[PDB]
Structure 1
């Protein structure tokens, strides 16, 4: 039955709008400056950064880091609320609900971060900002390579033309994974994933019939995510060695057990 999967697909688009205030659509309207309804403040060097706050309400490299760490937590809270709305997620072994979040969360961040990105920068601060890719690359040595990996992935990723209804199910799929180290009841997690996967596959053919082997292409990107996360996890640690100036958030370092 296919009309069962269209229920699950439209259901996860309701949760997605309810759990994530800035969608890809709202972000496209902003990034497509042809919709110059209310443009954002471009931050392209250290001088336009200091002018950022005064206007778009908020060392530079540390200050930008602590910024993306403020949104990181506001994403896990939205992800986590979205995690709860995936059928059967609340009924799972609550010890594995933590394992699902711990390993799956950054992968959703980078997925949805690609929405706010294009070749040149990233929508920041509810879409009121737009920090430049080059400015970020031209940061201090340990940070000149913090966002660039994500910008390279997002360019490959956004070429799939996924929309919010698409992304929703793909988001659920990533969350529900058996691969995660330390899962207890691996069996009931895989049961629901196959539902989402089936739901994903059908949603993709309906909304993108004129691109065959798209459901194919998307899943290869699910493993590309784990490389971003890993490499980012380990580069976040060598900075913890040289930068005792930093105080990383509780929630983030609660999940930042590497490997």
Structure 2
């Protein structure tokens, strides 16, 4: 028991509670369980929109205008930022696994490259809202009516995330069991273009244990509860393929160009 039981748990959540604090306890907290009991720095209202596109943005004066950085490029970059960030966050927490870093420099990334997805989206759903999504910043969230309110395309890169959560949230226990989950998805164990699927999928056998472990303990009922709770990937791996379907149909057939290299790279592999 103890072994990795409460050890790993404290770990998974440890390195995690360090990487991304945004959890169901923080998402469902500010969403209503906190923030003076009102709502998480809502992002969409002039007030927020201002302190947002101004703050979160800031320093953005150039010979643009006319037809540049549309309501998307701004939101798209932000509504997507949480992604480009996680990647940086996951690691901070991923490298926590006593096997991840033991894997391979590329392998580790490779998995994430195609893992971080099922990761950010793993808990994301939780950090979602009916018409918004918990966003780091001053502890708020990006509403749908907002993100959507713009480029037909870029104007729909969350509604599908949150929505899925509304159906996924029915599989998210405590950030604890979740914190691990992200790992159960981090260790690739189902990512194309892997390197050491031996150590990767192996490091998972652990993260998985903790999952159903502190999970089958914090809520012991049924069998392979996790085996059926993980299968959720569907809606998970789904959103992913979607997140691209948009950035893919655009990155390959944008509305009329409006991106930079920092992007072309992100999408690109390695």
Q: Shared fold by TM > 0.5?
A: yes
Q: Cα distance 1:9–1:257, how it changes in 2: closer, same or farther (>3 A)?
A: same
Give distance in 2, aligned partners of 1:142 and 1:30: 29
Question: What TM-score do you get using the length of structure 2 for normalisation?
Answer: 0.80
Aligned to 1:222: 233
Q: Note the C-alpha offset of 1:243.
A: 3.9
- Judge which range, 193-202 or 128-137, deviates more: 128-137
Give distance in 1, aligned partners of 2:144 and 2:183: 29
Q: Number of aligned residue pairs: give it.
A: 259
Give distance in 1, aligned partners of 2:104 and 2:139: 40
Q: Cα distance 1:74–1:145, how it changes in 2: closer, same or farther (>3 A)?
A: closer
2:118–2:240 Cα contact (<8 Å) kept: yes
Q: Note the C-alpha offset of 1:210.
A: 5.2
Give distance in 2, aligned partners of 1:120 and 1:212: 34
Cα RMSD (Å): 3.2
Deviations 1:201-239 (CA, angstroms, capped at 9, x unpaired): 121111122576631332121243222111221321222
Give distance in 2, aligned partners of 1:65 and 1:209: 41
Q: Note the C-alpha offset of 1:241.
A: 4.1
SS in structure 2 of the partner of residue 159 of structure 1: helix
2:99–2:199 Cα contact (<8 Å) kept: no
SS in structure 1 of the partner of residue 42 of structure 2: strand
SS in structure 2 of the partner of residue 74 of structure 1: helix
Q: Note the C-alpha offset of 1:41.
A: 4.1
Q: Cα distance 1:47–1:60, how it changes in 2: closer, same or farther (>3 A)?
A: farther
Q: Cα distance 1:241–1:156, how it changes in 2: closer, same or farther (>3 A)?
A: same
Aligned to 1:233: 244
Q: Note the C-alpha offset of 1:108.
A: 1.2
Question: What TM-score do you get using the length of structure 1 for normalisation?
Answer: 0.83
Gaps of 5+ in 2: 59-69
